[PDB]
């Protein structure tokens, strides 16, 4: 039952220890054409594909409350990187998938969430981080968290040079407990894919 | 990829002993000790896994002892019953498949340890 | 696509897994009855010869394809270049019978002699590998298509008609020594 | 009829051109044609 | 693969490129396969080529792999998944079903392509394929067996025989 | 009557001294999806737009047979430049428009043509350059040549790093003759726009 | 069928005599046939 296969563009991702997909704050995009862009917007289907990233090394020394973030979008080299630098205004939702493979004899729990409009959390607010679109990663049950969120912001189109709405966040809810037959460290990798990449207002070249 | 430093080498007579230490910064990959004999190719000596199994070259088997400390992020090589042959520069960095002892020509090395056994 | 590998069942996943599209295919040239139907030389030529399709070179097209199937059946066509008359005997005639004209005897024409022979073995299908012996390595004496005799045979070519192959076997290619891939001359326009 | 390109029928009968089969099934096509395809499990296109 | 083993072992390193081979039916990694055994007797080919990866680890070890098809045009093949992730790739985990099938597509200018590397020219006309290892958990020695077979629309065209006798 | 307006993408070009559009070798593209690309091709609508270039200075000293070329595609900095460097195989037809503004008191004639598979012309073959898709530029009548050609080549998709099929070519058929009330030099500018930019086989990044 | 003057059909089939085309338009005839002709303007015959 727990065999999932996510396909974006011409790339795929299969997982045999999945727990489900978590839709955060909506199931789809709002109206993409608006009165501000004056209908001079287009869609770039070539950008909607995965790109990998490295979050952190989940060791045994990190206690409750270790918070590791990734402000999206990040420094991208593919077609998305050129889109950020070539068109003035962009908008896109995210489809994020985080994997932390140990083996079934470890223990511990990761809270993987997506936070809009990141702001540094005080040691007390971290107890309510579960208000956001989130899942859990527990080597007892699963090894893959899969969240998907639309584009939400005060402006219909944004300038990702100045304002980065979403932030992927991973917190260690229960520290890793290892045995003689469990992994001694875990490496948490991320796999993110933009969806509905709309662009508007092309810029002059630097060549 | 990793920034790692070595220390502990020096000069000693035949039959002495030494303790080489290395400190690294990235992850928990299986480390090992390499030596470049004077005028010979760089060769692996002893390799250790991630918190566990160790493996030694045929010649240095039984006289050396490698150990790891995960908390301090350090690896140690205790050298006993030294011989004039063991003089070289003792580098340390990651190693793949400590069973077969296949070293990694991956990247940059840090030259920090020089051992000179006398006789 | 994901499956239980140890089941050994076939899995043929196509491009539509990631947005592609499978195109049309035409496989005439890799058909058995077609690819096996062409002349190949036999390099074991003597005053007398026993037509055995296993004397073909183990690397030529028809030869090495035939060695990649356990059982086979096919009628034959031969092209012989001889001096004198060419006498043929079926599967099982005594050797002395090769010396009489009552058997199929072709009198030589200028270029060469091209004959068509039927499958005459008593076994329902022949074999290229035989596990065991036949006397009370080498295949038994009854795996052949007859025998030919002339004063001196110069060149013999065989052709398998109506080929039928069963039970495939390993087929090899030339090993690459140290290169990343095998590199050889390809025909290219001069100058 | 592999590798034969004559339009006219053979001049000699079917009894003399080749042997005649007697009686009293393509396996690998059946094997390769029933090969599992598509995907397995769930799908999020 | 190296030393004539059909499996690649999980490596403990910061470099996570398990293997890399050219998409050419004459490649060194394909020198023993039946597919190349046929294709050595034909001039041109066309279609998709399937690769089957089978995990052979113990129940207490996990891993997550990725295979990407790097088309021709790049000078140096990528050495890390963060960089090769932009090609056509696929990722898979290890669980109950231990097999994974990836269809190396046929993407090239001419509708048919040769089955022999022409001359001392390098950088194969068809691109490479790189099998990476994203991460692994407690799989120190456990292997991954790789096999290759034909696709749903593979086709060989012109018969020859180049083997010297 | 002679007022033409060509719009490509989000850019336009109006001319009030036009003579018509010349379709070379066809009126539209052939089948873009083929058996070679395995249906893994896409279309980039963001590339179909004009970009300017400078061909040569038509002075009075240049005699009959001065041939000035431009092998397309050239070094482009926009989205087309990134497409050439990011996707292995491309294909696109061309829509070229050449302008040489003097004033109606000059004389002379330019032969503006598009040549497939350029090869250096001997002094004799130039008398038949009119076999190719061409127009004339004569300051007596018009100031704008407008040719449009599909993508033709031996391969359905090409690698513009190695093979450049089309070549824009301008030849001085009759030298410029100036008066006291005519321009003393003319500057020939080009305005080219790719159409039907299809791409296939994306490449790894250099970042 | 340019430059072939045999009344009888070819002895070998269409598959062996030549290659076979596959599928998935004479331009210059269309160009030269739509050439403007006649006169332009007025006429006083």
TrEMBL record, chains A, F:
Principal location: host cell
This protein's record includes keyword Membrane: no
One GO-annotated biological process of the protein: symbiont entry into host cell
Keywords recorded for this protein, A-Z: Capsid protein, Host cytoplasm, Host-virus interaction, Lipoprotein, Myristate, T=pseudo3 icosahedral capsid protein, Viral attachment to host cell, Virion, Virus entry into host cell
Function: Lies on the inner surface of the capsid shell. After binding to the host receptor, the capsid undergoes conformational changes. Capsid protein VP4 is released, capsid protein VP1 N-terminus is externalized, and together, they shape a pore in the host membrane through which the viral genome is translocated into the host cell cytoplasm. After genome has been released, the channel shrinks.
Residues covered by the Picornavirus capsid domain: 14-177
GO CC list: host cell cytoplasm; T=pseudo3 icosahedral viral capsid
Subcellular location: Host cytoplasm; Virion
UniProt-recorded Gene Ontology molecular function terms: structural molecule activity
Parent-protein residues present: 97 to 303 of 735
Keyword Lipoprotein: yes
Name of the featured protein: Genome polyprotein
Domain of life of the native organism: Viruses
UniProtKB/TrEMBL annotation, chains D, G:
Annotated compartments: Host cytoplasm; Virion
Source organism, top-level taxon: Viruses
Residue intervals passing through the bilayer: none
Leader sequence segment: none
Role according to the record: Lies on the inner surface of the capsid shell. After binding to the host receptor, the capsid undergoes conformational changes. Capsid protein VP4 is released, capsid protein VP1 N-terminus is externalized, and together, they shape a pore in the host membrane through which the viral genome is translocated into the host cell cytoplasm. After genome has been released, the channel shrinks.
Name used for this protein in its record: Genome polyprotein
Organism from which the protein derives: Foot-and-mouth disease virus A
Automatic annotation (TrEMBL), chain E:
Domain Picornavirus capsid: 1-129
Compartments, as annotated in UniProt: Host cytoplasm; Virion
Coiled coil: none
Role summary: Lies on the inner surface of the capsid shell. After binding to the host receptor, the capsid undergoes conformational changes. Capsid protein VP4 is released, capsid protein VP1 N-terminus is externalized, and together, they shape a pore in the host membrane through which the viral genome is translocated into the host cell cytoplasm. After genome has been released, the channel shrinks.
Protein name: Genome polyprotein
Residue window of the full protein shown: 360 to 524 of 735
């Amino acid at each position: 039952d727990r065999t999932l296969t996510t396909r974006n563009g011409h790339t795929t991702s299969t997982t045999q220890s999945s727990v489900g997909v978590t839709y955060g704050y909506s199931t789809g995009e709002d109206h993409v054409s608006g009165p501000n862009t004056s209908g001079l917007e287009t869609r770039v289907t070539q950008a909607e594909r995965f790109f990998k990233k490295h979050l952190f090394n989940w060791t045994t020394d990190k206690p409750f409350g270790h918070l590791e973030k990734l402000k999206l979008p990040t420094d991208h080299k593919g077609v998305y990187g050129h889109l950020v630098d070539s068109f003035a205004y962009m908008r896109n939702g995210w489809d994020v998938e985080v994997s932390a493979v140990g083996n079934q004899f470890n223990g511990g729990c990761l809270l993987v969430a997506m936070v809009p409009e990141w702001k540094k959390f005080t040691p007390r607010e971290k107890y309510q981080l579960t208000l956001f679109p989130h899942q859990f990663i527990s080597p007892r049950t699963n090894m893959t968290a899969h969240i998907t969120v639309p584009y939400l912001g005060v402006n219909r189109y944004d300038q990702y040079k100045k304002h980065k709405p979403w932030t992927l966040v991973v917190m260690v809810v229960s520290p890793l407990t290892t045995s003689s037959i469990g992994a001694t460290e875990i490496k948490v990798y991320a796999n993110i894919a933009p969806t509905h990449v709309h662009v508007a207002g092309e810029l002059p070249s630097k060549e | 990829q990793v920034q790692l430093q070595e220390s502990g080498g020096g000069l000693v007579q035949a039959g002495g002993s030494l303790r080489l230490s290395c400190v690294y910064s990235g992850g928990a990959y299986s480390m090992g000790w390499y030596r470049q004999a004077p005028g010979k190719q760089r060769e692996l000596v002893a390799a250790i896994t991630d918190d566990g199994i160790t493996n030694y070259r045929d010649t240095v088997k039984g006289r050396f002892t490698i150990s790891r400390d995960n908390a301090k992020k350090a690896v140690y090589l205790q050298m006993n019953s030294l011989k004039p042959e063991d003089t070289a520069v003792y580098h340390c960095n990651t190693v793949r498949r400590v069973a077969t002892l296949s070293g990694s020509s991956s990247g940059s090395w840090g030259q920090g340890t020089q051992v000179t056994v006398s006789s | 696509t994901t499956s239980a590998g140890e089941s050994a069942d076939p899995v043929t996943t196509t491009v539509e897994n990631y947005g592609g599209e499978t195109q049309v295919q035409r496989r005439h040239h890799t058909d058995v009855g077609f690819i096996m139907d062409r002349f190949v030389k036999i390099n074991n030529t003597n005053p007398t010869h026993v037509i055995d399709l296993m004397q073909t070179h183990q690397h030529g097209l028809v030869g090495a394809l035939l060695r990649a199937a356990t059982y086979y059946f096919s009628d034959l066509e031969i092209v012989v270049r001889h001096e004198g008359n060419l006498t043929w005997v079926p599967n099982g005639a005594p050797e002395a019978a090769l010396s009489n004209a009552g058997n199929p005897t072709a009198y030589n024409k200028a270029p060469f002699t091209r004959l068509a022979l039927p499958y005459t073995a008593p076994h329902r299908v022949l074999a290229t590998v035989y596990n065991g012996t036949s006397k009370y390595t080498q295949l038994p004496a009854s795996f052949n298509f007859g025998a030919i005799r002339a004063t001196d045979i110069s060149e013999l070519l065989v052709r398998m008609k109506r080929a039928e192959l069963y039970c495939p076997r390993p087929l090899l290619a030339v090993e690459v020594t140290a290169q990343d891939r095998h590199k050889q001359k390809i025909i290219a326009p001069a100058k | 009829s592999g590798n034969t390109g004559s339009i006219i029928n053979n001049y000699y009968m079917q009894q003399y051109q080749n042997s005649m089969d007697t009686q009293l099934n393509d396996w690998f096509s059946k094997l390769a044609s029933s090969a599992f395809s598509g995907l397995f499990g769930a799908l999020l296109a | 693969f190296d030393d004539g083993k059909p499996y690649v072992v999980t490596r403990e390193d910061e470099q996570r490129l398990l293997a890399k081979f050219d998409v050419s039916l004459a490649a060194k990694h394909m020198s023993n396969t039946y597919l190349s055994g046929i294709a050595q007797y034909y001039a041109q080919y066309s279609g998709t080529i399937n690769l089957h990866f089978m995990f052979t680890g113990s129940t207490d070890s996990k891993a997550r792999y990725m295979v990407a098809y790097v088309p021709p045009g790049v000078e140096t093949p990528p050495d890390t998944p963060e960089r090769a992730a932009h090609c056509i790739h696929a990722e898979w985990d290890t669980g109950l079903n231990s097999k994974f099938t990836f269809s190396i597509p046929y993407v090239s200018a001419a509708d048919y392509a040769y089955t022999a590397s022409d001359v001392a020219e390098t950088t194969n006309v068809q691109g490479w394929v790189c099998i990476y290892q994203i991460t692994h958990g407690k799989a120190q020695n456990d292997t991954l067996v790789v096999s290759v077979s034909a696709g749903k629309d593979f086709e060989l065209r012109l018969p020859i025989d180049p083997r010297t006798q």
